[PDB]
Amino acid sequence: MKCPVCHQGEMVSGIKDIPYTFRGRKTVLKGIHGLYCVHCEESIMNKEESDAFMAQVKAFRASVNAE
Ligand SMILES: [Zn+2]
């Protein structure tokens, strides 16, 4: 499929480590499955992929808020 954001790159199946900063705290969200644009790096995650990703995101946010 063509990337729905940059309209030139192709979407490919992959696993990526995703940097994230929340309330000034920096982390890398490891091993996130999804489709990724080879050109602009836009991600497309289906329901199951989104659930896994957001579990990581929310665990990180919770830890930051409690610290
Ligand atoms: Zn793209």
How many whole angstroms from 43 Cα to the centroid of ligand 1?
Answer: 8
In terms of Cα–Cα distance, which of 51, 57, 22, 20 is closest to 34? 51
| Alpha-carbon span 8 to 14, nearest angstrom | 18
Going along the chain, which residue ranges are E strands?
11-22, 25-37, 43-44
CB-based contacts of 10, cutoff 8 Å, min separation 6: 1, 2, 3, 37, 38, 39
Resolution (A): 1.7
How many whole angstroms from 63 Cα to the centroid of ligand 1?
Answer: 32
How many whole angstroms from 1 Cα to the centroid of ligand 1?
Answer: 10
How many whole angstroms from 7 Cα to the centroid of ligand 1?
Answer: 6
Fold of 1-67: Ubiquitin-like (UB roll) (3.10.20)
**52 token code pair:** 């896994």
**27 token code pair:** 């982390």
Name the CA dihedral angle for 36, 37, 43, 46, rounded to a multiple of 10 degrees.
Answer: -60
